[PDB]
Design a binder for this molecule. Sequence first.
Ligand SMILES: COc1ccc(OCCN2C[C@H]([C@H](O)CO)[C@H]3CCC[C@@H](C2=O)N3S(=O)(=O)c2cc(Cl)cc(Cl)c2)cc1OC
Length: 121
Amino acid sequence: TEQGEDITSKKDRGVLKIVKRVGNGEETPMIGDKVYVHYKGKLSNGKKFDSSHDRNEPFVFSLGKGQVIKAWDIGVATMKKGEICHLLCKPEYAYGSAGSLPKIPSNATLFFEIELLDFKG
Ligand SMILES: COc1ccc(OCCN2C[C@H]([C@H](O)CO)[C@H]3CCC[C@@H](C2=O)N3S(=O)(=O)c2cc(Cl)cc(Cl)c2)cc1OC
């Protein structure tokens, strides 16, 4: 609980969550919903590797369909509309030992700030 709440089903500390702003939303998105988020991702050296804010449009994906790294299918499923959270995503829940060059190094813990903007069934 020092670095956040373990939200993994295994309780292996692989995805840790800190709420930054509570959503006024009531339900989480459901599997298959189209979800709309803003995010900023940083490496452990503090370097921003990507941000939807920098494109001035949301990132959109279907929840729970393996369209994104595991940490996101887990983390976004816990969020309510309007919520902002920080997610610490160990490599086993992200890009693993390979990484994804050039932007993601090998064995990289990823640090996301995610805002849940909307979702639609
Ligand atoms: C089922 O397993 C995966 C499914 C998809 C995977 O990567 C592509 C999807 N993706 C990329 C998006 C953006 O489209 C990239 O600009 C982005 C947001 C959603 C989470 C994650 C992300 O999951 N990434 S990212 O911020 O971790 C990311 C940014 C950049 Cl610049 C490069 C890469 Cl490789 C990842 C990766 C997966 O496993 C490693």
